[PDB]
């Protein structure tokens, strides 16, 4: 499965100018394009080499789409003040995420097209891609308007058409980058705590794709809530990073072992304090 998703944000700032507007596009867990109204040059920009192969028509077209969206969101921020009857001097946020998850074989799995206002669900297109779920009173007003206007129909056309077709194109043109495999490097580090015991930290870095399994075992038994497992996140070079730590008794670290599983490894990697 693969995905093409766009994360959009509009943040008003009364007294500081027009709302800040941003768009970030991702193929799976990798950003490849972005738009920021506050950038040195406010237009669509590549964020990965493989997308740079797209001609000028692509950048001017996406730039136009982004600026058109920006105007739409400016209007939406004003309307929202009215729906919620809020003061006109405060800052507010409108968020939107749309995209498609496609089956291992160019078959659409799920479509997304949802909004949030001031960090809370506002309205979202249901899985049938034909109906809307409004989270509150105000969103109910938007829903009625979109049903009468036929918004879903056009939105679905994007998800089932453009979103799917372009993702296929992106996966092909960016194959060397998007479908590559960078093996993880792993380490275990040893820090004595002030309380007298020891914190063992298992590192996993420089890997791609993001999916990875990192765990601590005690006497060959996987630990769960007893260890601290942070979520994996990106590094600056397009790879990912993760780590897990466990507090163990001073003198008993030979009993703890860290396990790493990743498609970039030929077999699970087991490490110990060293």
């Amino acid at each position: 499965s693969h995905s093409l998703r766009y994360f959009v944000t509009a943040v008003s700032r009364p007294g500081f100018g027009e709302p800040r507007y941003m768009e970030v596009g991702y193929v799976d867990n990798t950003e490849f394009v972005r738009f920021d109204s506050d950038a040195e040059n406010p237009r669509y920009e590549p964020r990965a080499r493989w997308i740079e192969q797209e001609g000028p028509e692509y950048w001017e077209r996406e730039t136009r789409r982004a600026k058109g969206n920006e105007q739409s969101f400016r209007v939406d921020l004003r309307t929202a003040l009215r729906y919620y009857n809020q003061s006109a001097g405060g800052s507010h946020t409108l968020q939107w995420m749309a995209g498609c998850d496609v089956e291992s074989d160019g078959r659409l799995l799920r479509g997304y097209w949802q909004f949030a206002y001031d960090g809370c669900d506002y309205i979202a297109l249901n899985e049938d891609l034909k109906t809307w779920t409004a989270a509150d009173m105000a969103a109910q007003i938007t829903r009625r308007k979109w049903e009468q206007a036929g918004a879903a129909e056009r939105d679905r056309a994007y998800l089932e058409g453009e979103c799917v077709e372009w993702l296929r194109r992106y996966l092909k043109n960016g194959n060397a980058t998007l479908l590559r495999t960078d093996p993880p490097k792993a380490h275990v580090t040893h820090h004595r705590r002030p309380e007298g015991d020891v914190t063992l930290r298992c590192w996993a870095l420089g890997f791609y794709p993001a999916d990875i399994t990192l765990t601590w075992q005690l006497n060959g038994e996987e630990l769960t809530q007893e260890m601290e497992l942070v979520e994996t996140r990106p590094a600056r070079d397009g790879t990912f990073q993760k780590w897990a730590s466990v507090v163990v008794p001073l003198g008993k670290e030979q009993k703890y072992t860290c396990h790493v599983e990743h498609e970039g490894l030929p077999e699970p990697l087991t490490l110990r304090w060293g």
Binding site: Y6, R65, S72, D76, T79, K145, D155, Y158, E162, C163
Partner: peptide
């Protein structure tokens, strides 16, 4: 390519 709000405002 990305999604378009078109003219469907909230």
């Amino acid at each position: 390519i990305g999604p378009g709000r078109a003219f469907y405002t909230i």
